[PDB]
Each structure stands twice: as structure tokens, then as C-alpha cells.
Design a protein around this motif. Structure first.
Motif, PDB file in Angstrom:
ATOM      1  N   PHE A   3      73.981 -76.075  -2.936  1.00  0.00           N
ATOM      2  CA  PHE A   3      75.137 -76.292  -2.084  1.00  0.00           C
ATOM      3  C   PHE A   3      74.716 -76.635  -0.658  1.00  0.00           C
ATOM      4  N   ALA A  11      83.881 -73.103  -0.609  1.00  0.00           N
ATOM      5  CA  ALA A  11      84.010 -72.563  -1.954  1.00  0.00           C
ATOM      6  C   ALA A  11      84.238 -71.050  -1.933  1.00  0.00           C
ATOM      7  N   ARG A  14      87.802 -70.312  -0.853  1.00  0.00           N
ATOM      8  CA  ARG A  14      88.794 -70.592  -1.878  1.00  0.00           C
ATOM      9  C   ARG A  14      88.862 -69.494  -2.932  1.00  0.00           C
ATOM     10  N   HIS A  15      87.737 -68.836  -3.241  1.00  0.00           N
ATOM     11  CA  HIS A  15      87.670 -67.751  -4.196  1.00  0.00           C
ATOM     12  C   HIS A  15      87.954 -66.374  -3.543  1.00  0.00           C
ATOM     13  N   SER A  86      76.885 -74.239 -11.875  1.00  0.00           N
ATOM     14  CA  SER A  86      77.255 -74.963 -10.644  1.00  0.00           C
ATOM     15  C   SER A  86      78.578 -74.478 -10.031  1.00  0.00           C
ATOM     16  N   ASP A  87      79.417 -73.833 -10.810  1.00  0.00           N
ATOM     17  CA  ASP A  87      80.675 -73.254 -10.348  1.00  0.00           C
ATOM     18  C   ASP A  87      80.461 -71.776 -10.018  1.00  0.00           C
ATOM     19  N   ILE A  88      80.837 -71.361  -8.801  1.00  0.00           N
ATOM     20  CA  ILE A  88      80.459 -70.021  -8.344  1.00  0.00           C
ATOM     21  C   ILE A  88      81.425 -68.903  -8.721  1.00  0.00           C
TER      22      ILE A  88
HETATM   23 BR   LIG Z   1      82.678 -73.718  -6.970  1.00  0.00          BR
END
Ligand SMILES: [Br-]
Ligand SMILES: [Br-]
Ligand SMILES: [Br-]
Ligand SMILES: [Br-]
Ligand SMILES: [Br-]
Ligand SMILES: [Br-]
Ligand SMILES: [Br-]
Ligand code: NA
Length: 129
Positions: A3, A11, A14-15, A86-88
Motif C-alpha cells: 500500500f 482504507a 473506511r473500515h 490484498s483486502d485488509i
Molecule cells: Br482494502
């Protein structure tokens, strides 16, 4: 995936990590910098046989299952490989459980030794948030 600094900050926000348990976004970005250099695929073995996985270097001794840490728990209910995506999302959700377990972000030794007490807002300076 490696990243960018402000990409990861966005990111994490957003989470729902921004101000989670009172820790501002810069604290999370700093911890990710020194744990993994922002690389979701980072892994490191520890002396006791457990392994740390992902952008926040979550430990298999307690938090995930990797098939090779005898006696350990899996408190986030996840395969450690999910922390390398790749998605956290999985790393973030597990980090929220870890930072809630009594010791706050002192759970991350790199945060205590390299972020705590410093100008962590520097890590999100310039980012469009
Ligand atoms: Br992500
Ligand atoms: Br950087
Ligand atoms: Br195991
Ligand atoms: Br092995
Ligand atoms: Br368990
Ligand atoms: Br705390
Ligand atoms: Br901050
Ligand atoms: Na485990």
C-alpha cells in the motif's frame, strides 16, 4: 500488495479504525509502517514457533490458525492466510479485537517502541481525508 501511505490511511478509515478505542488514524498507519512496511504479504517467525502475519503482523499464538503453532488459540476465528490478502478487512477486524484486550496498542511492540509518544499525525499529513 504494498500500500501507499495515504491509500492505507483511507482504507483504515473506511473500515472504522480511525479513533477506534481512542487511537487516532496516524497511530495505526505508523504501526503498519514499522510492522510490515505497508506490505500485506509480510510474515515473520517468532522464537516460540508462532508466526506474525500481514500489514499489522498479527500473531498465530493467539489470534489465527496456521496449522503449525501447537497449543495456540485462534481468537479471531480465521486462517492466518486471510491476513495476507490484498483486502485488509480481516486484518482490521482482528486488530479491533486485539486492541480491546486490555493493553491497547502496546500489543504491538513496534508501536510502543517507535510510535508511542511521537508525532504520529505526521503519518497522515497531506492525505485527502
Ligand atoms: Br482494502
Ligand atoms: Br512512507
Ligand atoms: Br496450530
Ligand atoms: Br513449516
Ligand atoms: Br480459541
Ligand atoms: Br487504551
Ligand atoms: Br493522527
Ligand atoms: Na493459532
Amino acid at each position: 500488495k504494498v500500500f501507499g501511505r495515504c491509500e492505507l490511511a483511507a482504507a483504515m478509515k473506511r473500515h472504522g479504525l480511525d479513533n477506534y478505542r481512542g487511537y487516532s488514524l496516524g497511530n495505526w498507519v505508523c504501526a503498519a509502517k514499522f510492522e510490515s512496511n505497508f506490505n500485506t504479504q509480510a510474515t515473520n517467525r517468532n522464537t516460540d514457533g508462532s508466526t506474525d502475519y500481514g500489514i499489522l503482523q498479527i500473531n498465530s499464538r493467539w489470534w489465527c490458525n496456521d496449522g503449525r503453532t501447537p497449543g495456540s488459540r485462534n481468537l479471531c476465528n480465521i486462517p492466518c492466510s486471510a491476513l495476507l490478502s490484498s483486502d485488509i478487512t480481516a486484518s482490521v477486524n482482528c486488530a479491533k479485537k486485539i486492541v480491546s484486550d486490555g493493553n491497547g496498542m502496546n500489543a504491538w511492540v513496534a508501536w510502543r517502541n517507535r510510535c508511542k509518544g511521537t508525532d504520529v499525525q505526521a503519518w497522515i499529513r497531506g492525505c485527502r481525508l
